[PDB]
Write a protein that binds this ligand. Structure first.
Ligand SMILES: O=c1ccn([C@@H]2O[C@H](COP(=O)(O)OP(=O)(O)O)[C@@H](O)[C@H]2O)c(=O)[nH]1
Ligand SMILES: NC(=[NH2+])NCCC[C@H](N)C(=O)O
Length: 303
Protein backbone atom coordinates (compact mmCIF):
# COMPACT_ATOMS: atom_id res chain seq x y z
CA UNK A 1 0.00 0.00 0.00
CA UNK A 2 0.87 3.71 0.41
CA UNK A 3 0.27 4.05 4.20
CA UNK A 4 -1.18 2.48 7.37
CA UNK A 5 -3.18 3.99 10.25
CA UNK A 6 -2.66 3.34 13.97
CA UNK A 7 -4.60 4.69 16.97
CA UNK A 8 -6.68 6.74 14.50
CA UNK A 9 -3.48 8.62 13.44
CA UNK A 10 -2.25 8.05 9.85
CA UNK A 11 1.27 6.94 8.87
CA UNK A 12 2.70 7.04 5.31
CA UNK A 13 4.96 4.32 3.94
CA UNK A 14 8.59 5.58 3.67
CA UNK A 15 11.28 4.18 1.29
CA UNK A 16 14.50 2.45 2.41
CA UNK A 17 16.23 1.73 -0.88
CA UNK A 18 19.24 -0.44 -1.72
CA UNK A 19 21.75 2.23 -0.69
CA UNK A 20 20.62 1.56 2.87
CA UNK A 21 23.34 -0.40 4.64
CA UNK A 22 22.81 -3.62 6.52
CA UNK A 23 24.25 -3.41 9.98
CA UNK A 24 25.49 -6.33 11.99
CA UNK A 25 27.11 -6.09 15.39
CA UNK A 26 29.57 -8.03 17.46
CA UNK A 27 30.58 -6.91 20.91
CA UNK A 28 33.00 -9.52 21.96
CA UNK A 29 33.19 -10.02 25.59
CA UNK A 30 36.53 -11.78 25.28
CA UNK A 31 38.97 -11.29 22.42
CA UNK A 32 41.69 -13.66 23.78
CA UNK A 33 39.70 -16.86 23.14
CA UNK A 34 40.35 -15.86 19.52
CA UNK A 35 43.61 -16.10 17.64
CA UNK A 36 45.30 -12.67 17.58
CA UNK A 37 45.31 -12.99 13.82
CA UNK A 38 41.77 -14.39 13.59
CA UNK A 39 38.75 -12.20 12.87
CA UNK A 40 37.46 -11.70 16.36
CA UNK A 41 34.00 -12.56 15.29
CA UNK A 42 32.46 -15.83 16.24
CA UNK A 43 32.01 -18.46 13.52
CA UNK A 44 31.10 -21.76 15.20
CA UNK A 45 28.81 -24.66 14.48
CA UNK A 46 25.91 -23.54 16.67
CA UNK A 47 26.39 -19.96 15.47
CA UNK A 48 28.90 -19.47 12.69
CA UNK A 49 28.27 -15.80 12.74
CA UNK A 50 31.19 -14.75 10.62
CA UNK A 51 29.75 -16.94 7.84
CA UNK A 52 26.23 -15.36 8.15
CA UNK A 53 27.56 -11.84 7.56
CA UNK A 54 29.81 -12.63 4.57
CA UNK A 55 27.04 -14.54 2.84
CA UNK A 56 24.80 -11.57 3.59
CA UNK A 57 27.37 -9.25 2.03
CA UNK A 58 27.74 -11.57 -0.98
CA UNK A 59 23.94 -11.69 -1.55
CA UNK A 60 24.13 -7.82 -1.49
CA UNK A 61 27.38 -6.79 -3.18
CA UNK A 62 25.98 -3.43 -4.15
CA UNK A 63 24.59 -2.32 -0.79
CA UNK A 64 26.91 -1.25 2.03
CA UNK A 65 27.30 -3.64 4.96
CA UNK A 66 28.48 -2.38 8.36
CA UNK A 67 30.04 -4.53 11.09
CA UNK A 68 29.60 -2.68 14.37
CA UNK A 69 32.36 -4.05 16.59
CA UNK A 70 33.70 -3.37 20.11
CA UNK A 71 36.18 -5.12 22.41
CA UNK A 72 39.76 -4.75 23.56
CA UNK A 73 41.22 -5.90 20.24
CA UNK A 74 44.80 -6.90 19.44
CA UNK A 75 46.56 -5.15 16.55
CA UNK A 76 46.54 -8.39 14.58
CA UNK A 77 42.83 -8.91 15.25
CA UNK A 78 42.10 -5.40 13.91
CA UNK A 79 43.98 -6.41 10.70
CA UNK A 80 42.07 -9.66 10.43
CA UNK A 81 39.13 -7.27 9.95
CA UNK A 82 41.38 -5.21 7.67
CA UNK A 83 41.91 -8.15 5.33
CA UNK A 84 38.13 -8.72 5.65
CA UNK A 85 37.49 -5.17 4.41
CA UNK A 86 39.73 -5.40 1.32
CA UNK A 87 38.89 -9.04 0.56
CA UNK A 88 35.25 -7.83 0.54
CA UNK A 89 34.92 -4.05 -0.03
CA UNK A 90 31.20 -3.51 0.70
CA UNK A 91 31.98 -4.64 4.28
CA UNK A 92 32.91 -1.74 6.57
CA UNK A 93 34.20 -2.51 10.06
CA UNK A 94 33.28 0.23 12.57
CA UNK A 95 34.81 0.49 16.08
CA UNK A 96 32.49 1.70 18.86
CA UNK A 97 35.28 3.88 20.33
CA UNK A 98 35.61 5.71 16.94
CA UNK A 99 32.11 7.24 17.50
CA UNK A 100 31.34 10.10 19.91
CA UNK A 101 28.05 9.69 21.77
CA UNK A 102 28.43 12.70 24.15
CA UNK A 103 25.34 14.46 22.71
CA UNK A 104 23.10 11.55 23.80
CA UNK A 105 24.69 10.99 27.23
CA UNK A 106 23.88 11.61 30.90
CA UNK A 107 25.40 11.35 34.39
CA UNK A 108 23.78 8.97 36.87
CA UNK A 109 24.41 11.54 39.61
CA UNK A 110 22.17 13.79 37.56
CA UNK A 111 19.68 11.02 36.73
CA UNK A 112 19.34 9.73 40.31
CA UNK A 113 19.18 13.09 42.11
CA UNK A 114 16.40 14.00 39.63
CA UNK A 115 14.26 11.10 40.82
CA UNK A 116 15.23 11.63 44.45
CA UNK A 117 13.78 15.15 44.08
CA UNK A 118 10.64 13.98 42.21
CA UNK A 119 9.80 11.44 44.94
CA UNK A 120 10.60 13.78 47.87
CA UNK A 121 8.35 16.36 46.17
CA UNK A 122 5.35 13.95 46.37
CA UNK A 123 2.95 13.39 49.24
CA UNK A 124 4.53 11.12 51.85
CA UNK A 125 1.17 9.38 52.14
CA UNK A 126 1.35 8.61 48.35
CA UNK A 127 4.98 8.07 47.43
CA UNK A 128 7.15 5.13 46.61
CA UNK A 129 9.46 5.24 49.63
CA UNK A 130 10.60 1.73 48.63
CA UNK A 131 11.90 3.28 45.38
CA UNK A 132 12.72 6.56 47.16
CA UNK A 133 15.24 4.69 49.34
CA UNK A 134 16.72 2.61 46.45
CA UNK A 135 17.69 5.49 44.17
CA UNK A 136 19.49 7.12 47.19
CA UNK A 137 21.57 3.99 47.77
CA UNK A 138 22.23 3.78 44.02
CA UNK A 139 23.20 7.39 44.59
CA UNK A 140 25.24 6.42 47.66
CA UNK A 141 27.04 3.75 45.57
CA UNK A 142 27.84 5.86 42.47
CA UNK A 143 29.43 8.70 44.54
CA UNK A 144 31.75 6.26 46.29
CA UNK A 145 32.25 4.45 42.96
CA UNK A 146 32.96 7.35 40.62
CA UNK A 147 31.74 10.95 40.48
CA UNK A 148 31.59 11.25 36.65
CA UNK A 149 30.00 7.90 35.73
CA UNK A 150 27.33 8.11 33.01
CA UNK A 151 24.64 6.01 31.30
CA UNK A 152 26.83 5.23 28.35
CA UNK A 153 29.82 4.18 30.48
CA UNK A 154 27.69 2.15 32.83
CA UNK A 155 26.40 -0.11 30.19
CA UNK A 156 29.78 -1.63 29.72
CA UNK A 157 31.23 -4.89 28.56
CA UNK A 158 30.88 -6.03 32.11
CA UNK A 159 27.10 -5.60 31.94
CA UNK A 160 26.46 -8.38 29.47
CA UNK A 161 23.80 -7.89 26.83
CA UNK A 162 23.23 -4.32 28.00
CA UNK A 163 26.68 -3.61 26.58
CA UNK A 164 25.60 -4.28 22.93
CA UNK A 165 21.84 -3.74 22.99
CA UNK A 166 22.35 -0.22 24.45
CA UNK A 167 25.01 0.90 21.90
CA UNK A 168 22.95 -0.64 19.13
CA UNK A 169 20.19 1.89 19.76
CA UNK A 170 22.77 4.68 19.83
CA UNK A 171 24.22 3.48 16.49
CA UNK A 172 20.85 3.69 14.78
CA UNK A 173 20.38 7.20 16.19
CA UNK A 174 23.56 8.10 14.29
CA UNK A 175 22.35 5.98 11.35
CA UNK A 176 24.22 6.03 8.02
CA UNK A 177 26.14 9.24 8.86
CA UNK A 178 28.29 7.07 11.19
CA UNK A 179 30.09 5.45 8.24
CA UNK A 180 31.29 8.99 7.60
CA UNK A 181 32.05 9.78 11.26
CA UNK A 182 34.65 6.92 11.65
CA UNK A 183 35.95 7.80 8.16
CA UNK A 184 35.12 4.57 6.29
CA UNK A 185 36.07 4.45 2.55
CA UNK A 186 33.73 4.26 -0.45
CA UNK A 187 30.70 5.41 1.57
CA UNK A 188 30.10 8.74 -0.29
CA UNK A 189 27.10 6.90 -1.84
CA UNK A 190 25.22 7.09 1.54
CA UNK A 191 22.58 9.75 1.87
CA UNK A 192 22.78 12.25 4.74
CA UNK A 193 20.87 11.72 7.99
CA UNK A 194 20.07 8.41 6.33
CA UNK A 195 18.80 5.26 7.93
CA UNK A 196 20.17 1.73 8.33
CA UNK A 197 19.11 -1.88 8.95
CA UNK A 198 20.60 -3.68 11.94
CA UNK A 199 20.65 -7.43 11.87
CA UNK A 200 21.30 -10.07 14.46
CA UNK A 201 24.21 -11.99 12.98
CA UNK A 202 21.82 -14.94 12.83
CA UNK A 203 19.04 -13.48 10.63
CA UNK A 204 19.94 -15.05 7.30
CA UNK A 205 19.90 -13.33 3.97
CA UNK A 206 18.78 -15.74 1.36
CA UNK A 207 18.11 -13.62 -1.58
CA UNK A 208 18.06 -9.90 -2.13
CA UNK A 209 16.07 -7.75 0.26
CA UNK A 210 15.24 -4.90 -2.13
CA UNK A 211 13.58 -1.58 -1.28
CA UNK A 212 11.78 -1.55 2.05
CA UNK A 213 8.67 0.40 3.05
CA UNK A 214 7.73 1.12 6.65
CA UNK A 215 5.18 2.97 8.81
CA UNK A 216 7.01 6.30 9.30
CA UNK A 217 10.22 4.53 8.20
CA UNK A 218 10.69 2.19 11.17
CA UNK A 219 10.20 -1.48 11.86
CA UNK A 220 11.46 -4.05 14.31
CA UNK A 221 11.56 -7.77 14.68
CA UNK A 222 8.60 -9.35 16.33
CA UNK A 223 8.79 -12.71 17.96
CA UNK A 224 5.77 -14.96 17.51
CA UNK A 225 6.06 -18.14 19.56
CA UNK A 226 3.81 -20.19 19.65
CA UNK A 227 1.00 -18.26 21.25
CA UNK A 228 3.18 -15.27 21.95
CA UNK A 229 4.25 -12.09 20.31
CA UNK A 230 6.94 -9.76 21.39
CA UNK A 231 8.92 -7.04 19.86
CA UNK A 232 12.54 -7.90 19.40
CA UNK A 233 15.90 -6.24 18.96
CA UNK A 234 16.82 -8.92 16.47
CA UNK A 235 15.89 -6.63 13.62
CA UNK A 236 15.98 -2.88 13.68
CA UNK A 237 15.46 -0.71 10.57
CA UNK A 238 15.02 3.08 10.40
CA UNK A 239 14.88 5.51 7.43
CA UNK A 240 16.95 8.35 8.96
CA UNK A 241 19.35 9.53 11.63
CA UNK A 242 17.77 10.21 15.04
CA UNK A 243 14.31 8.77 14.40
CA UNK A 244 11.76 10.22 16.94
CA UNK A 245 10.35 6.86 18.31
CA UNK A 246 13.91 5.93 19.41
CA UNK A 247 14.58 9.52 20.47
CA UNK A 248 11.60 9.28 22.90
CA UNK A 249 13.18 6.06 24.17
CA UNK A 250 16.47 7.84 24.75
CA UNK A 251 14.45 10.38 26.86
CA UNK A 252 12.83 7.62 28.90
CA UNK A 253 16.36 6.38 29.58
CA UNK A 254 17.29 9.90 30.75
CA UNK A 255 14.11 10.16 32.94
CA UNK A 256 14.09 6.75 34.66
CA UNK A 257 16.44 5.36 37.24
CA UNK A 258 17.37 1.87 36.01
CA UNK A 259 16.17 2.32 32.42
CA UNK A 260 16.60 -0.74 30.21
CA UNK A 261 17.30 -0.78 26.39
CA UNK A 262 14.69 -3.47 25.84
CA UNK A 263 11.75 -2.51 28.07
CA UNK A 264 12.18 1.30 28.20
CA UNK A 265 14.15 2.56 25.20
CA UNK A 266 13.12 0.10 22.47
CA UNK A 267 9.73 -1.06 23.61
CA UNK A 268 8.08 1.88 25.37
CA UNK A 269 9.81 4.46 23.10
CA UNK A 270 8.33 3.01 19.93
CA UNK A 271 4.93 2.51 21.50
CA UNK A 272 4.60 5.86 23.37
CA UNK A 273 5.48 7.67 20.20
CA UNK A 274 3.27 5.43 18.11
CA UNK A 275 0.74 5.02 20.92
CA UNK A 276 1.39 7.61 23.55
CA UNK A 277 -1.80 6.78 25.36
CA UNK A 278 -2.50 3.05 24.84
CA UNK A 279 -5.70 3.09 22.72
CA UNK A 280 -4.59 0.07 20.61
CA UNK A 281 -3.68 -3.30 22.08
CA UNK A 282 -0.01 -4.21 22.60
CA UNK A 283 -0.31 -6.94 19.92
CA UNK A 284 -2.04 -4.54 17.52
CA UNK A 285 1.10 -2.43 17.90
CA UNK A 286 3.37 -5.48 17.43
CA UNK A 287 1.55 -6.12 14.16
CA UNK A 288 1.72 -2.44 13.10
CA UNK A 289 5.45 -2.23 13.83
CA UNK A 290 6.39 -5.72 12.53
CA UNK A 291 9.22 -5.99 10.05
CA UNK A 292 8.31 -8.45 7.29
CA UNK A 293 10.82 -9.97 4.89
CA UNK A 294 10.50 -13.35 3.20
CA UNK A 295 14.17 -13.38 2.05
CA UNK A 296 15.48 -13.56 5.66
CA UNK A 297 15.16 -16.67 7.81
CA UNK A 298 14.56 -14.78 11.03
CA UNK A 299 16.46 -15.37 14.29
CA UNK A 300 18.05 -18.73 13.54
CA UNK A 301 19.82 -18.86 16.96
CA UNK A 302 16.65 -20.38 18.47
CA UNK A 303 17.67 -23.49 16.45
O1 LIG B 1 28.66 -11.81 22.48
C1 LIG B 1 27.75 -11.30 21.83
C2 LIG B 1 26.55 -11.98 21.75
C3 LIG B 1 25.52 -11.41 21.01
N1 LIG B 1 25.71 -10.23 20.42
C4 LIG B 1 24.63 -9.63 19.65
O2 LIG B 1 23.38 -10.26 19.89
C5 LIG B 1 22.74 -10.57 18.64
C6 LIG B 1 21.81 -11.78 18.71
O3 LIG B 1 22.36 -12.76 19.61
P1 LIG B 1 21.91 -14.30 19.57
O4 LIG B 1 20.99 -14.54 18.39
O5 LIG B 1 23.18 -15.12 19.63
O6 LIG B 1 21.18 -14.44 21.02
P2 LIG B 1 19.60 -14.25 21.29
O7 LIG B 1 19.36 -12.82 21.69
O8 LIG B 1 18.88 -14.59 20.01
O9 LIG B 1 19.46 -15.26 22.41
C7 LIG B 1 23.92 -10.77 17.70
O10 LIG B 1 23.59 -10.57 16.32
C8 LIG B 1 24.90 -9.74 18.17
O11 LIG B 1 24.60 -8.49 17.55
C9 LIG B 1 26.96 -9.56 20.53
O12 LIG B 1 27.16 -8.45 19.97
N2 LIG B 1 27.95 -10.12 21.23
N1 LIG C 1 16.12 -10.43 19.10
C1 LIG C 1 15.99 -11.73 19.05
N2 LIG C 1 15.69 -12.31 17.89
N3 LIG C 1 16.14 -12.41 20.19
C2 LIG C 1 16.04 -13.85 20.33
C3 LIG C 1 14.63 -14.36 20.44
C4 LIG C 1 14.56 -15.86 20.28
C5 LIG C 1 15.43 -16.68 21.26
N4 LIG C 1 16.83 -16.92 20.73
C6 LIG C 1 14.73 -18.00 21.59
O1 LIG C 1 15.21 -18.74 22.46
O2 LIG C 1 13.69 -18.37 21.02
Amino acid sequence: SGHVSFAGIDYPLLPLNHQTPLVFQWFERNPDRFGQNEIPIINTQKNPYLNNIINAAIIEKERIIGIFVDGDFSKGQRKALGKLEQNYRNIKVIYNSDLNYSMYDKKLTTIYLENITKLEAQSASERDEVLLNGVKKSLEDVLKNNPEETLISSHNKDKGHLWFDFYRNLFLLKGSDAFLEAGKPGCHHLQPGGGCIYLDADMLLTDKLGTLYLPDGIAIHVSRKDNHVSLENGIIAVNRSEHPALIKGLEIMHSKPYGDPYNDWLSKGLRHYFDGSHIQDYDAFCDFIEFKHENIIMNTSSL
